[PDB]
Structure formats: structure tokens, C-alpha cells
């Protein structure tokens, strides 16, 4: 395909995010950058840290421009402080352009960098509304679109156990099978969407759909788990436990506190249920559903002849987060230009000879507009 040089441009370690190479400054300084659709700041380590192999050296970049402004970004877990500036940025396995973008030079951090992750910075791909210090700090993708011809769209194929593709400016048809189904971006801050129904092994969880989106539902490549609001999490676990009752597991397993291990290659995938989220469609009263397997929501832990897994559906107090657990099933199109997100079955998703992830529709769902939090 025409976007062939962008295929396979992502790497990572399971549970530690996916990163892309970005070349910053002049002469070039290439760094590994975590791809995060759940935040909106481009930031790179810029001082030594025990967990960093390399970092951004501003004094060596002739094109660096100091903004004389500090910046601080806290995440669900982790935080960093740094200094704002602009510099030239290219993505060597991305679009054939170079932009002048805002960059936060990370000078201090807490629980942000990860020993052995191989990444040195983060690329916040969400919208300006959630940028720090405020919405006047243009995010990277905004700069890319404003300064160049590159279409206002990117797509992510995250291939779990790590690798994948970030196609920038379009879609590559080798990365999915079947059809792309689109759900509206409800509001441009996070990539916010609306979940209208949840099933476990085809069985409706039967909660009011407002619960699923309280107080938001977002697509977040920078979060590992599928995170669910407390009431939804509790109901989901009870249903998943019931569906997998041919085996018993300790309470702490379902809470992500205990791991369970199997002899290499013997994991009984079949005893665990599939999980479906129905998403609002592009036509009135029409929805579609995405369905993931235990291969997605049971995550291999690093890492003998024993395959250990963590249950990667967890509780949230800030709404639903569709993290890697969801995304690893699918090719996900962030169609900013048309304010929609597309899902199709991923050509690289992990499955078995019995079940596959799925994206199916259309279905009929009424009053979907009421599901959203105000």
C-alpha cells in the first residue's frame, strides 16, 4: 500500500506502552516516544535518569527555542515537571514532513519512566482542551495538520503478545480484515465515545447505559487496562466469574492483585468469556459492537516454562478507559477530520482456532443520546 513505510513503526514491551521513533532538533536527536491518545502534551526526558538510556540535549540543538515557561503534567499514575520550548520534529517512519512543535523538556519526574521500557518521552495525541499548562499550548498533531498537507487522521494497530503500526494521514488496508465501523467522537478533548450496551458471552450486563459512561468513556492507548466505573466493574466481574465457573480463581485475581500461571502453552482460553461493547453508530438508533477475547483481557506478565497472567480489567473513578486491552483487538482509526473513531478486526490480534475478535453491526439501540454524561 501507499503507506507501507509506516507499517510496523511501533515497538513496546507488554504492559509498558507502545512507542514510535521521533527525531527532534538539529542536528538530529532520535528518541523513542510512547504513543498516548489519552493526553495532549509532547514531552521528552531531557536530563539523565536511572531508567533513561538517552535524553533530549537542548544545548546541542541549534533550532531549539526556549519558551521560558514551566510545565507540569500529572497522569492517573505518574507525573513529570519540565520546561517548554519549540523545536523541529520529524517522524522518520511517519509522514515525510518536518514541523516546529511544542516540546516539554522533562527535567524531573515521579513514577513516570519505567525501568527497561525503552521509551524516553510521550506523545499526547488528544486535543488542546486537555493540554497543560492550558489549551493555548498547541498539541503535536495540531501542529502537524496546520503546518503541512498531512490529512487530519491517524490510525493505530497495536499488536499485543510487542509491535504495531501508527499510520499517519490515512489508513492502511493490510492492517485489518472485514469492515470499519465508526462511532462519533462525542467531544474533542479526550477521544470521548459512548458505550450503549455491554455483553459477557452474549449476555447483556443489563445496566443503565448512563453507568457505562459515567463520567466519560475514552479511547486511551497510554493505558494498559480496560478500566470500568466501580458499579460497572463489579457487575462485569460477577458475570465473568459466572461464565468461567468451570474453574475457580481467588478474589484477588479478579482485583489484579494475584496472578495465575499455566504450564507454557496450556492456557485454557476457552473457559473465559468474550466481552462485547456496543458503541453508538453514525446513524440514528444504530449501533455496532466490538468483541474481545480473553487473549486481550488476560495479560502475560514479564515473564521459564510458566505463562503467568494478570486480569487486566480494573476499576476506575474517572469513567471508562478503553486501553490496550480493547485496542489490541482492533485497527483503530482516529478520524479527527470527520470527528469519528473507526474499529475493524486487527490483522495482528491474538486469537485461537476457535474464536476471533469481532466488529459487527448494525444493531438497533434506542435513546443512545441519553447514555452520555452531562
Amino acid at each position: 500500500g501507499s503507506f507501507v513505510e509506516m507499517v510496523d513503526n511501533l515497538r513496546g514491551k507488554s504492559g509498558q506502552g507502545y512507542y514510535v521513533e521521533m527525531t527532534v532538533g538539529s542536528p538530529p536527536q532520535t528518541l523513542n516516544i510512547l504513543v498516548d491518545t489519552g493526553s495532549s502534551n509532547f514531552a521528552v526526558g531531557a536530563a539523565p535518569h536511572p531508567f533513561l538510556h538517552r535524553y533530549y540535549q537542548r544545548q546541542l540543538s541549534s533550532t531549539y527555542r526556549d519558551l521560558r515557561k514551566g510545565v507540569y503534567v500529572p497522569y492517573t499514575q505518574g507525573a513529570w515537571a519540565g520546561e517548554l520550548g519549540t523545536d523541529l520534529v520529524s517522524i522518520p517512519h511517519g509522514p515525510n514532513v518536518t514541523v516546529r512543535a511544542n516540546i516539554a523538556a522533562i527535567t524531573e519526574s515521579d513514577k513516570f519512566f519505567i525501568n527497561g521500557s525503552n521509551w524516553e518521552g510521550i506523545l499526547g495525541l488528544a486535543y488542546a482542551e486537555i493540554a497543560r499548562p492550558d489549551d493555548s499550548l498547541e498539541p503535536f498533531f495540531d501542529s502537524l495538520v496546520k503546518q503541512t498537507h498531512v490529512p487530519n487522521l491517524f490510525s493505530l494497530q497495536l499488536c499485543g503478545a510487542v509491535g504495531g503500526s501508527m499510520i499517519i494521514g490515512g489508513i492502511d488496508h493490510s492492517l485489518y480484515t472485514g469492515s470499519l465501523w465508526y462511532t462519533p467522537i462525542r467531544r474533542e478533548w479526550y477521544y470521548e465515545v459512548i458505550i450503549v450496551r455491554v455483553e459477557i458471552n452474549g449476555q447483556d450486563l443489563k445496566m443503565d447505559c448512563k453507568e457505562y459512561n459515567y463520567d466519560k468513556s475514552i479511547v486511551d492507548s497510554g493505558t494498559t487496562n480496560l478500566r470500568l466505573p466501580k458499579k460497572v466493574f463489579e457487575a462485569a466481574v460477577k458475570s465473568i466469574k459466572a461464565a468461567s465457573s468451570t474453574e475457580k480463581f481467588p478474589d484477588g485475581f479478579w482485583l489484579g492483585e494475584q496472578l495465575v500461571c499455566w504450564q507454557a502453552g496450556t492456557t485454557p482460553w476457552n473457559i473465559f468469556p468474550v466481552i462485547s461493547l456496543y458503541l453508538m453508530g453514525e446513524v440514528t438508533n444504530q449501533s455496532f459492537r466490538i468483541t474481545i477475547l480473553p487473549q486481550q483481557y488476560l495479560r502475560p506478565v514479564e515473564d521459564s516454562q510458566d505463562d503467568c497472567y494478570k486480569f487486566a480489567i480494573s476499576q476506575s473513578s474517572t469513567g471508562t478507559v478503553m486501553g490496550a486491552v480493547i485496542m489490541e483487538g482492533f485497527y483503530v482509526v482516529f478520524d479527527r477530520a470527520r470527528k469519528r473513531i473507526g474499529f475493524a478486526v486487527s490483522a495482528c490480534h491474538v486469537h485461537d482456532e476457535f474464536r476471533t475478535a469481532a466488529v459487527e453491526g448494525p444493531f438497533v439501540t434506542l435513546d443512545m443520546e441519553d447514555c452520555g454524561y452531562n
Binding site: 504492559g15 509498558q16 498516548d36 489519552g38 495532549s40 497522569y75 488528544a126 486537555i130 497510554g222 493505558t223
Partner: peptide, 7 residues
């Protein structure tokens, strides 16, 4: 990983 708190 668990990426924005706040926004």
C-alpha cells in the same frame, strides 16, 4: 501503564 489525571 496508566497515562491524563485532571484535564
Amino acid at each position: 501503564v496508566q497515562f491524563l489525571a485532571x484535564x
